[PDB]
């Protein structure tokens, strides 16, 4: 039982629907739904600013009662074209993403079960580890690496 790509899709769709202009007084920018779960190449990208949600490893822990802690790493990359200045724009965007990731409820992902039925599910918490900027890149093209480790618990199993 895993929901890795399900978690990524939940986070990406959260970014999408919580970045429109419906909250101009809370968020800065408006990605206009330019959010995706996979990118072919930085060069391949065309429209900016563009935020990429990646998939990392997933450490696992086992608890006595059959519970199961799973820590999933969700590196998130963002890009922006230097319309005025890369630093400030990346700051605005990272602030927006931090607000998206620290306000609101829990990561609501849909787990598609083998029988063919999908059930709403909720992650436990979403803690960020560190934000990093890959400076020295092409001046009109910026990059800010924001790293998150989503902590989610799967459906109970492994009884025996």
């Amino acid at each position: 039982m895993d929901h890795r790509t399900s978690i990524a899709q939940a986070m990406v769709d959260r970014i999408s629907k919580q970045m429109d202009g419906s909250q101009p007084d809370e968020y800065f920018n408006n990605l206009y739904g330019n959010v995706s779960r996979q990118t072919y190449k930085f060069e391949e990208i065309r429209e900016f600013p563009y935020v990429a949600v990646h998939i990392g490893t997933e450490t696992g822990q086992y608890l006595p009662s059959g519970q199961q802690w799973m820590f999933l790493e969700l590196p998130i990359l963002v890009y922006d074209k230097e319309k005025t200045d890369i630093q400030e724009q990346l700051e605005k965007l990272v602030a927006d993403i931090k607000t998206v990731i620290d306000t609101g409820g829990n990561l609501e992902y849909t787990v598609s079960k083998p029988n063919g039925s999908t059930f709403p599910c909720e992650a436990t918490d979403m803690i960020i580890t560190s934000v990093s900027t890959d400076e020295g890149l092409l001046a009109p093209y910026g990059l800010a690496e924001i790293n998150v480790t989503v902590r989610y618990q799967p459906p109970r199993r492994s009884l025996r």
Binding site: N106, F119, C121, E122, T124, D125, I127, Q153, P155, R156
Partner: peptide, 18 residues
């Protein structure tokens, strides 16, 4: 013992000390 559905419902109710 608690069935699968109850675990499903419960896991979305944890409380963060954060």
């Amino acid at each position: 013992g608690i069935d699968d559905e109850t675990y499903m419902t419960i896991q979305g109710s944890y409380i963060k000390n954060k």
